[PDB]
From a paper:
[name] is a phosphoglucomutase enzyme catalyzing the conversion of glucosamine-6-phosphate to glucosamine-1-phosphate, which is subsequently used to produce the essential peptidoglycan precursor UDP-N-acetyl-glucosamine. [name] (also referred to as DacA in some bacteria) is a membrane-bound cyclase with three predicted N-terminal transmembrane helices and a cytoplasmic catalytic [name] domain. c-di-AMP is formed from two molecules of ATP by enzymes containing a [name] domain. As part of the current study, we investigated how the activity the B. subtilis c-di-AMP cyclase [name] is regulated by [name], a phosphoglucomutase enzyme required for the synthesis of an essential peptidoglycan precursor.
On the other hand, diffracting crystals were obtained for the [name]:[name] complex, in which the [name] protein lacks the flexible C-terminal domain 4. The crystals were obtained under two different conditions (see Experimental procedures section), and the structure of the [name]:[name] complex could be solved at 3.6 Å (Complex 1) and at 4.2 Å (Complex 2) by molecular replacement using the B. subtilis [name] and [name] (dimer) structures as search models. Furthermore, in both complex structures, three complex molecules were obtained in the asymmetric unit and each complex was composed of a [name] dimer and a [name] dimer in the inactive dimer configuration. Since the obtained complex structures were basically identical, all further descriptions are based on the higher resolution complex 1 structure. In the complex, a [name] dimer was positioned in the large groove at the top of the [name] dimer and formed interactions with domain 2 of [name]. The complex was asymmetric, with one of the [name] monomers, [name](2) (shown in light blue in Fig. 4) placed in the center of the [name] groove and the other monomer, [name](1) (shown in dark blue in Fig. 4) projecting toward the solvent. PDBePISA analysis revealed an average buried surface area of 996 Å2 in the interface between [name](1) and the [name] dimer, which was stabilized by four hydrogen bond and four ionic bond interactions between [name](1) and [name](1) and five hydrogen bond and three ionic bond interactions with [name](2). The main interactions in the complex were formed between three residues, D151, E154, and D194 of domain 2 in [name](1) and residue R126 in each of the [name] monomers. The active site in [name](2) was completely occluded upon interaction with the [name] dimer (dark blue [name] monomer with active site region highlighted in yellow) but the active site in [name](1) appeared at least partially exposed (light blue [name] monomer with active site region highlighted in green). Although the active site of the [name](1) was exposed and accessible in the complex with [name], in an active dimer conformation, parts of the second [name] molecule would collide and overlap with [name], highlighting that also [name](1) cannot form active head-to-head oligomers in the complex.
Author numbering:
A (entry chain I): 107 to 252
B (entry chain A): 2 to 369
C (entry chain J): 107 to 253
D (entry chain B): 3 to 368
Write the structure that this text describes.
């Protein structure tokens, strides 16, 4: 319905940043209220579009130090800060972005997508579990599970 | 040259190239290039060296101690530094790096407003002031102090430039990149990605300690093996500061600066863009390079080693293309110093436009 | 009443892109309906803030070639295409961005701010007239189009 | 003699030279290197235009001896101390000169515990600044210092302050005067994220306008602003955000003694005031102690300067201390004077009692 869009935008944005190895951190809300984490970033409440998402995570920019938060089908805020998980199952030298993703996935039902600035591989975080190096259709099926 | 050698001020960091020395460099250089305009616009860039941060801090402290407006750029190639200093009409530009040298070494390099190395008179005055044991230079205070405008987005400007110098996107070309763990690490992987090419990366993971560490133009054997591993169409090996370029054909053989010069100048002649159909080069070039240049009816002017003489000749005679066997290629149509990524884009232009593989294009020039 | 908060964001964004060399084209709706031109870009309906605008007009990026249109204190859309001005009288200075800005000022009452990609000078277009070389506080005082 | 009361201070470039800041960073990093051969010094500044120059020189110095440096950007000195403690970091540096004019600046040091460096360490740092031989180690290659900017620390120090509020301040109109200093971005986020109607002023720094007719030392602008916007109260922090001066709805100034009285009285009403005592300086007003007796709160007096206030709170394990300046220490939460913490405690009192600021401040008669 209106789920095919926004989902299409997320996958297109993620493939765009993956081909260019642009670090990204996008947290999709479902049932747990994350307003306390939204109020830490730059509020946008913008309609979701691939171009806007790409523009948010440009290498060095005011709207890049932090995570994008998606509430409903709108980018509620950008450059939001998430807690670090300090877990040993995070493959080291990565962290920072991945640590924040798994940390926010430990506390909430949120689905967190990550794009590595070092490798360009797409990662996903849910319930404290981080799956690295996902394919385009793996992310597509995961985002249709939402 | 006391402090200003061929590649500016160089030394092993902290021990030889001390942060105090970098501070004096920034202060005295900003003063000498201040004289006319009240508040110069020096912008500064570096490679990924662990000493880069310390030297940048000292340099910005110096530049602000005489009122110069400072535009930090972060990690960006020396070509990008020159391009931004010119395209922004800024009084001077600084690159803290020491191309292809080991991580322990570093260096400060200066560019004028035109995008070229500072005039020897200015460097002479800078060294004159570094001998007086009295810092009798003005010490602005309050609002007279220097100003700082971080411009870490500058890369994408220099990126948007390179992107437009491609005759078309390179769709269907598999290219391996060796960025020496240097300044081009973030840039190149972005650039060829925006030109629709399947990039395969290596030496694109810097950590301040691994620059030019068995990777880069000086150590292309890793890329030679990697190209055969990923069966890519070609491999590109930039160096630390991204001013050189060394190619690798699909067979895994090295394609030095002479072969790339031949290929690109031949393509430019095929487009009529080669000015007077001449190519500037150094003594270091191979005999077969000039042989094939004659075979394709391309005149050539030779200068002494070092790219300041190559650019001197291209300057006075208004020549389009110049280069060295090192891979340092100057295309004066687009930039004023050697540009690894620009040279790579020209090579990709030739590849795409002729459809031949890199080995076949490089085989036209026979080395002696 | 709290529109000064929004002017603060606009002035900071424009002075930021002007201090460097970042091209910008910001239109702002007033009384004429600009939906015909809004529906040509990427819809955002976002809260304003300077950072979003600066991010919008960054090189290489997708929705940066074109103009963002500001509606009721919200960035309605970006990368919108504006009509170019067939009027002569100015062309000598290249145009393109300035031409597109001036074109919308005859058809609308909108106040369009422009940042030159070559000079970095701030320009404004209103009622078909294009004011060149604006100072930081001249634009700020100029932006009192709000009552 | 470089380390006065407020660390090393001077007018920038002319007296507090970047060479001097470099020597400070290098020798202090050596002094704080003795444990691990890579200390974790983190560094922050206010909005002073000399902040960038002094920070560059300081980071160059700290990296010239191998110290790992964590830049923080613009953040209050309280935030610096809180972050250095909460991060188990060896030291923290603040480039600022509280409430002084923009032309002046200064370097201040905090140990791992969050307190001013021990006088032995400062003595050694000054000892090394006298030998005309920079015979200290010059690490090279991989032995050099490392820097990983941590501009997010602010939001940590913010996330801390946010939890020290007994509830959100809904329905309270508050005017903020941040002196165009470090508290400009923080405070406006804080009280807005705590659901309070904020009206801002002096929250627009440009590196030249710090402490310019605004802040705790110049509260008349905020005094007029409170009556203009008919706010319930106005809060005036200073340049580095360590002091606080309140303004009631009537427009009157509420100095540090009145704020100490109000907050200690509320804390006693919550039983959180340790031993029902309050530490203060000679500079405090007689009526402050009078009302302290009237509310059954004991009091300890120390010499002027906050090192003695915190000395007393240290040895005797006391909860609250302060000065008439507005420099208030709540040792339950922080180790130096904290403008925003004091403001949060005052807002706690306001919300919990519902009374206006004038009525709360009238209990203590000057």
């Amino acid at each position: 319905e209106a789920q095919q869009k926004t989902i299409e935008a997320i996958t297109k944005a993620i493939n765009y940043m993956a081909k260019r190895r642009i670090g990204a951190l996008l947290t999709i809300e479902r049932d747990t209220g994350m307003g306390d984490y939204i109020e830490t970033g730059i509020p946008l409440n913008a309609k979701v579009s691939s171009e806007l998402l790409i523009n948010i995570f440009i290498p060095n920019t005011p709207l890049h130090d932090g995570a994008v938060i998606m509430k409903n089908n709108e980018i509620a805020a950008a450059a939001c800060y998430l807690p670090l998980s300090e877990s040993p199952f995070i493959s080291k030298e990565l962290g920072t972005r991945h640590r924040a993703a798994v940390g926010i996935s430990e506390v909430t039902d949120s689905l967190t997508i990550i794009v590595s600035e070092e490798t360009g591989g797409v990662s996903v975080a849910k319930n404290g579990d981080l799956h690295r190096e996902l394919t385009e259709e793996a992310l597509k099926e995961m985002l249709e599970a939402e | 040259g006391k402090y200003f050698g061929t590649d500016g001020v160089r030394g092993v960091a902290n021990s030889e190239l001390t942060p105090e020395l970098a501070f004096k460099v920034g202060r005295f250089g900003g003063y000498v290039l201040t004289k006319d305009k009240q508040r110069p616009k020096v912008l500064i860039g570096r490679d990924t060296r662990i000493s880069g941060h310390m030297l940048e801090g000292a340099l910005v402290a110096g530049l602000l101690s005489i009122g110069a407006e400072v535009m930090r750029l972060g990690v960006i190639s020396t070509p990008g530094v020159s391009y931004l200093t010119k395209a922004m009409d800024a009084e001077a530009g600084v690159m803290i790096s020491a191309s292809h040298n080991p991580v322990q070494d570093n260096g400060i390099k200066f560019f004028g407003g035109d995008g070229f190395k500072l005039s020897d008179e200015q460097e002479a005055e800078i060294e004159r002031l570094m001998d007086e044991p009295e810092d009798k230079l003005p010490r602005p205070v309050g609002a007279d102090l220097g100003l700082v405008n971080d411009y870490f987005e500058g890369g994408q400007k220099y990126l948007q430039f390179l992107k437009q110098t491609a005759d078309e996107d390179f769709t269907g070309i598999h290219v391996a990149l060796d960025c020496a763990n240097g300044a081009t690490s973030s840039l190149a992987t972005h650039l060829f990605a925006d030109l629709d090419a399947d990039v395969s990366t290596m030496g694109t993971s810097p950590n301040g300690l691994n620059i030019n560490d068995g990777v880069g133009s000086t150590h292309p054997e890793a890329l030679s093996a990697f190209v055969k591993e990923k069966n890519a169409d070609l491999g590109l090996a930039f160096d630390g500061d991204g001013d050189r370029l060394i190619a690798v054909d699909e067979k895994g053989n090295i394609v030095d600066g002479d072969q790339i010069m031949y290929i690109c100048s031949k393509h430019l002649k095929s487009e009529g863009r080669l000015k007077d159909d001449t190519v500037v080069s150094t003594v270091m070039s191979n005999l077969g390079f000039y042989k094939a240049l004659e075979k394709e009816g391309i005149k050539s002017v030779q200068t002494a080693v070092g790219d300041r003489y190559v650019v001197e000749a291209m300057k006075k005679d208004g020549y389009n293309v110049g280069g060295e066997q090192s891979g340092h290629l100057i295309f004066l149509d687009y930039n004023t110093t050697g540009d690894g990524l620009l040279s790579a884009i020209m090579l990709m232009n030739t590849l795409k436009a002729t459809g031949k593989p890199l080995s076949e294009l490089a085989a036209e020039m026979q080395k002696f």
